Enzyme design. Structure first.
Site, PDB file in Angstrom:
ATOM      1  N   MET A 182       0.818  -1.214   0.000  1.00  0.00           N
ATOM      2  CA  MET A 182       0.000   0.000   0.000  1.00  0.00           C
ATOM      3  C   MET A 182       0.855   1.270   0.000  1.00  0.00           C
ATOM      4  SD  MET A 182      -3.345  -0.895   2.279  1.00  0.00           S
ATOM      5  CE  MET A 182      -2.367  -0.901   3.809  1.00  0.00           C
ATOM      6  N   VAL A 202       4.502  -0.983   3.894  1.00  0.00           N
ATOM      7  CA  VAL A 202       3.188  -1.212   4.507  1.00  0.00           C
ATOM      8  C   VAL A 202       2.334  -2.024   3.560  1.00  0.00           C
ATOM      9  CG1 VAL A 202       1.076  -0.165   5.472  1.00  0.00           C
ATOM     10  CG2 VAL A 202       3.268   0.948   5.823  1.00  0.00           C
ATOM     11  N   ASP A 211       7.908  14.056  11.472  1.00  0.00           N
ATOM     12  CA  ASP A 211       7.601  13.759  10.066  1.00  0.00           C
ATOM     13  C   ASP A 211       6.096  13.974   9.775  1.00  0.00           C
ATOM     14  OD1 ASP A 211       8.432  13.060   7.443  1.00  0.00           O
ATOM     15  OD2 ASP A 211       8.498  10.918   7.897  1.00  0.00           O
ATOM     16  N   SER A 228       1.227  15.145   4.740  1.00  0.00           N
ATOM     17  CA  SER A 228      -0.035  14.597   4.312  1.00  0.00           C
ATOM     18  C   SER A 228       0.033  13.077   4.070  1.00  0.00           C
ATOM     19  CB  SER A 228      -0.511  15.293   3.059  1.00  0.00           C
ATOM     20  OG  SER A 228       0.501  15.289   2.089  1.00  0.00           O
ATOM     21  N   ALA A 229       1.194  12.534   3.701  1.00  0.00           N
ATOM     22  CA  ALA A 229       1.327  11.076   3.565  1.00  0.00           C
ATOM     23  C   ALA A 229       1.196  10.322   4.912  1.00  0.00           C
ATOM     24  CB  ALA A 229       2.655  10.713   2.892  1.00  0.00           C
TER      25      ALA A 229
HETATM   26  C1  LIG Z   1       3.961   4.266   7.741  1.00  0.00           C
HETATM   27  C2  LIG Z   1       2.905   3.797   8.720  1.00  0.00           C
HETATM   28  C3  LIG Z   1       1.647   3.416   8.280  1.00  0.00           C
HETATM   29  C4  LIG Z   1       0.703   2.956   9.187  1.00  0.00           C
HETATM   30  C5  LIG Z   1      -0.646   2.556   8.735  1.00  0.00           C
HETATM   31  N1  LIG Z   1      -1.051   2.553   7.454  1.00  0.00           N
HETATM   32  C6  LIG Z   1      -2.304   2.114   7.532  1.00  0.00           C
HETATM   33  C7  LIG Z   1      -3.225   1.996   6.378  1.00  0.00           C
HETATM   34  O1  LIG Z   1      -4.316   1.504   6.439  1.00  0.00           O
HETATM   35  N2  LIG Z   1      -2.728   2.569   5.232  1.00  0.00           N
HETATM   36  C8  LIG Z   1      -3.202   2.754   3.907  1.00  0.00           C
HETATM   37  C9  LIG Z   1      -4.462   2.310   3.482  1.00  0.00           C
HETATM   38  C10 LIG Z   1      -4.852   2.514   2.183  1.00  0.00           C
HETATM   39  O2  LIG Z   1      -5.905   2.256   1.590  1.00  0.00           O
HETATM   40  C11 LIG Z   1      -5.813   2.653   0.398  1.00  0.00           C
HETATM   41  N3  LIG Z   1      -6.784   2.494  -0.636  1.00  0.00           N
HETATM   42  C12 LIG Z   1      -6.592   3.124  -1.974  1.00  0.00           C
HETATM   43  C13 LIG Z   1      -7.597   4.247  -2.280  1.00  0.00           C
HETATM   44  O3  LIG Z   1      -8.936   3.761  -2.138  1.00  0.00           O
HETATM   45  C14 LIG Z   1      -9.181   3.337  -0.798  1.00  0.00           C
HETATM   46  C15 LIG Z   1      -8.220   2.209  -0.350  1.00  0.00           C
HETATM   47  N4  LIG Z   1      -4.608   3.222   0.142  1.00  0.00           N
HETATM   48  C16 LIG Z   1      -4.010   3.131   1.324  1.00  0.00           C
HETATM   49  N5  LIG Z   1      -2.789   3.575   1.694  1.00  0.00           N
HETATM   50  C17 LIG Z   1      -2.332   3.379   2.986  1.00  0.00           C
HETATM   51  N6  LIG Z   1      -0.983   3.876   3.119  1.00  0.00           N
HETATM   52  C18 LIG Z   1      -0.057   3.410   4.181  1.00  0.00           C
HETATM   53  C19 LIG Z   1       1.216   4.218   3.849  1.00  0.00           C
HETATM   54  C20 LIG Z   1       0.603   5.475   3.199  1.00  0.00           C
HETATM   55  O4  LIG Z   1       1.022   5.574   1.850  1.00  0.00           O
HETATM   56  C21 LIG Z   1      -0.924   5.344   3.187  1.00  0.00           C
HETATM   57  C22 LIG Z   1      -2.539   1.900   8.855  1.00  0.00           C
HETATM   58  O5  LIG Z   1      -1.531   2.180   9.489  1.00  0.00           O
HETATM   59  C23 LIG Z   1       1.022   2.924  10.535  1.00  0.00           C
HETATM   60  C24 LIG Z   1       2.276   3.317  10.982  1.00  0.00           C
HETATM   61  N7  LIG Z   1       3.207   3.734  10.068  1.00  0.00           N
END
Ligand SMILES: Cc1cc(-c2nc(C(=O)Nc3cc4oc(N5CCOCC5)nc4nc3N3CC[C@@H](O)C3)co2)ccn1
Ligand SMILES: Cc1cc(-c2nc(C(=O)Nc3cc4oc(N5CCOCC5)nc4nc3N3CC[C@@H](O)C3)co2)ccn1
Ligand SMILES: Cc1cc(-c2nc(C(=O)Nc3cc4oc(N5CCOCC5)nc4nc3N3CC[C@@H](O)C3)co2)ccn1
Ligand SMILES: Cc1cc(-c2nc(C(=O)Nc3cc4oc(N5CCOCC5)nc4nc3N3CC[C@@H](O)C3)co2)ccn1
Lengths: 289, 283, 284, 286
Positions: free
Chosen positions: D29, D37, D142, D145-146
């Protein structure tokens, strides 16, 4: 074909006295167009688009009759329909079927909070716009201002070419009044030539907007002109994959590269090496598949 | 024209029609609905009383969807007439049905009044397009209003749809949403208006059209309870909203009340419903 | 103060609750809910949001006395009071996520509680009841409207107006019918009644259903215990459908605890310590 | 406090830690602070699994667990568990179904643009999170927005506390963070909560404009710079407002900008503390 004649005062009434505030903040203005502003209107039970013209009084009144004449001749499902006009009041008005999804430019930029176009819709819009240009060229008309702001989108996201104020008969001529939109224009058109091959070039730019979601020109960008990415890609620093609009979930490489191949050919700098519109349709059909 | 699929492509793409919640998303109008991936496009595949009837509602759906393309109707991508079963393939609706979002199923948050108004206007634009094109849906309800990535309302399931008052022997639909005349076999677009009125009450109250464990069990009935001044619409407003003002809710209720007129001829036509729903967000 | 019990004047509390504005907070008012023999308003004292209870009681003193004695992370904190003015006021630390009842019903558009939070809230509420019983206090009105939720969804037992030191009997039978043990309904006062009421709370947590609904069958949530034991239904069938993350094993384990808490013979119910342990083992 | 997972359960549920993006059929992700992650399914729960020389990484493992043990708040991502036993060290978190604020600001993977109304809620929520960290004497280091994640209801959740520190101004040799969001002092090795405020100011500009903090193909390339362009009256904030909103009124946008401007003061000591930022963001709605 002959059109309904409206009085100015009906159009004034139904556009709330030509309220120039945006529709989002309760006004009637939907956009500024080719030599005029475009308002929303309600005639009978029909939502409509009203263009009030506002280069000189000789030229504007000349692009009024041009538009009516071209629209009288040119009726196709991928061209905006003219419902009528008004000559009688202060200003000259053109009345069109309302396009509830606005312009392709505005949907590519997700203006006013609309969601991004899927690759699937984008492919349909590309095929549709090309069917429209093909109809114009088959009927010996040159648009001269093909761009995403002039591809309107209806209730079903069917592409509709609009603004034939600049249009000409075929059915190569020259001109003193060079008109159009710089960022979409072929080199020859920028120098006053008038040929349907210029329309093909401008369509190529539209296809790059569709793939990248980037406007043809951005003052705060490098390159500032979207056509330049063709160069950056051919000199293998970048690839088309790198420019694909990131606001899509459903774009496969093969189909994107196929649309790019068409845009690249459309953007050939030598007018004579560009494909004709029929070849563009065929290639866009094969892309779906 | 639509993409023509072979059965084996659809079987492949739905993981052999895996009926676990898997690839199954729900049970639909006369069939099951699976998730699928063609290229990088998520899609919905519907695999489909008697052998004569199902094959008849297959062609009906394709014919209606061929004619009817609009942003507030689910889009047909393709079909498959070879193989064992008959399949219909649709654009995927990542927020599912209005019914499920009204009930916050699987932990989704409650729809704001603002989204609710947009969904109502959208569903009405869809019904208007169907009626303008001389089609009657016959099964308007919240389970058949799907929601895309932006919560745009999409009318779905045109298996029961008809061209344009007739009568019939096979009375079809969903009881809790049906007009009295439709329950007696009449076929008119005015029945769609009535059913839309019920949908508008689901939107305002968040209550399902029928609940066996409730009083009244039929949501329609609250119209009576309100007109006989025991209760008011304010009392029924979904409590899972923070942003619903009285004026706009009462305006939507006014539209629903008119849609729910028991005399079919006194109901407004769909165009009037659109207009009234537009005025509600102004006003 | 931050380490002290503030004595407030009525006029400060009147000022900071906008003259005790009885309209809901959603439509710009100050009322957050009706409580145990009083209304609860939102207030701003200094830079601190607070909760002000104007009674609506006589037994104002009971609440102050119990809250003076009973301080624990799973009990709402009293900040102060006001005995001058017309009305008697109690001032509490503000609980930004309101009551468990309201979050179970997703009131005012809040999203449904995950099973994971629900388990934490259950464990927290039981730590609170355990602290009360260890300190020889009986709550007498355990229910989801009296389990408040802070910024981190930590469970906080509230409303000790009815509380007693810590079997006695009474003439004034008090509490909430749908949560009450049979013996409590007949005037007995025992901590075992608290256990029964907690069992009902655990069923609200699993099902998301209120303890009583006039427009329902059964109208009393307790009754589902019967429907489940006579194998017409199972607990799986009652699981709140507004959850994506509830596994059968953990839900059945919470249900097992609720079932034991809901034993009709007071003496066969587990004590609160056993309830904690069982809720710990559930997570694992 | 936290569930102890074995490595092989996490390997199983992330499809052997498939490092291809979820869009092309993988499990990754995003990249985090010193780890990747992945998406995972344990029981009926979707989860996020973070897989991280041996001394420093194992030290930021215990830091994160220790900080998350101490710091629980509705505007911080929750740690569910960890795994020490396998080859790699894993941290497991509650899944955030709307991803990062960065990705929603850019409408990545076709998601619709955030309304001004949601944007205001996300800003207030992120500030409640930072306020909780500072009240508890923790510095994030840190903020960007990310690292502001969005749950099913678009509630803001601050994430990535691998770099976080206690208060309880220090200096350091290992300067860490994200350049485009960093205060001048943080770029020089100071460690203060005032650096978090500066970085939040940048986040507030992303929220208003929808522009990323840095774009290599842009002028200015650093979003911070628009503060200068606005103060020297060539442009105004009105000119930078994200055009993908229909519901942004000038007064509220200018009020958020006023907060961002103050957060972006170059002299650390003139910046408002996080409490003042909350208050100002509350007054904006209202
Ligand atoms: C670095 C770190 C991360 C986390 C932590 N991360 C999530 C989590 O759930 N993350 C996440 C979920 C997502 O769901 C989608 N989807 C695409 C668009 O449609 C909807 C679905 N994209 C996503 N990206 C994600 N990332 C994660 C790194 C960052 O780029 C954002 C939960 O804890 C905890 C402690 N340290
Ligand atoms: C120059 C010209 C124009 C036309 C002609 N114009 C329309 C028309 O209907 N236009 C239109 C409609 C719109 O509806 C919305 N809405 C807001 C976003 O959400 C969805 C609703 N925006 C819209 N913008 C529009 N603009 C206005 C000019 C152009 O920028 C496109 C129809 O013919 C014909 C000949 N010459
Ligand atoms: C009966 C019928 C259906 C359709 C047709 N259906 C879909 C479609 O995409 N469907 C769909 C998608 C869903 O996505 C989610 N969510 C995922 C995220 O998290 C929350 C859950 N739930 C969903 N439910 C769905 N159901 C399936 C049964 C039907 O009631 C709608 C598209 O066309 C067309 C013609 N006739
Ligand atoms: C009876 C009693 C009450 C209290 C006591 N009460 C609070 C307190 O803070 N309460 C509270 C807070 C709230 O915050 C929100 N929300 C904000 C976010 O958005 C959704 C709405 N709703 C809320 N409701 C509340 N009510 C009050 C009655 C009770 O059912 C819950 C604190 O001590 C103490 C001793 N005896």
């Amino acid at each position: 074909t002959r059109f309904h004649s409206f009085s100015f005062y009906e159009l004034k009434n139904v556009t709330n006295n030509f309220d120039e505030r945006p529709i989002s903040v309760g006004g009637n203005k939907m956009g500024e167009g080719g030599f005029g502003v475009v308002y929303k209107g309600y005639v009978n039970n029909t939502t409509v688009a009203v263009k009030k013209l506002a280069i000189t009084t000789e030229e504007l009144k000349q692009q009024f009759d041009q538009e009516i004449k071209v629209m009288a001749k040119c009726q196709h499902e991928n061209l905006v329909e003219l419902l009528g006009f008004s000559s009688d009041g202060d200003d000259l008005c053109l009345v069109y079927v309302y396009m509830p999804n606005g312009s392709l430019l505005d949907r590519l930029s997700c203006l006013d909070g609309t969601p991004p176009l899927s690759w699937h819709m984008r492919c349909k819009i590309a095929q549709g716009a090309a069917n429209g240009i093909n109809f114009l060229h088959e009927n010996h008309h040159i648009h001269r201002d093909i761009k995403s702001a002039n591809i309107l989108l209806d209730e079903a996201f069917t592409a509709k070419i609009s603004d034939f104020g600049l249009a000409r008969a075929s059915e190569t001529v020259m001109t003193s009044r060079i008109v159009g939109t710089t960022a979409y224009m072929a080199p020859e058109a920028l120098r006053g030539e008038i040929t349907p091959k210029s329309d093909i070039y401008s369509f190529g730019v539209v296809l790059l907007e569709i793939i990248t979601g980037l406007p043809a020109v951005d003052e705060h960008r490098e390159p500032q002109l979207l056509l330049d990415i063709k160069e950056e890609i051919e000199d293998e620093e970048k690839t088309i994959e790198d420019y694909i609009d990131k606001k899509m979930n459903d774009a496969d490489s093969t189909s994107v590269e196929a649309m790019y191949s068409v845009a690249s050919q459309c953007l050939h700098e030598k007018k004579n090496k560009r494909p004709d519109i029929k070849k563009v349709q065929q290639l866009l059909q094969e892309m779906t598949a």
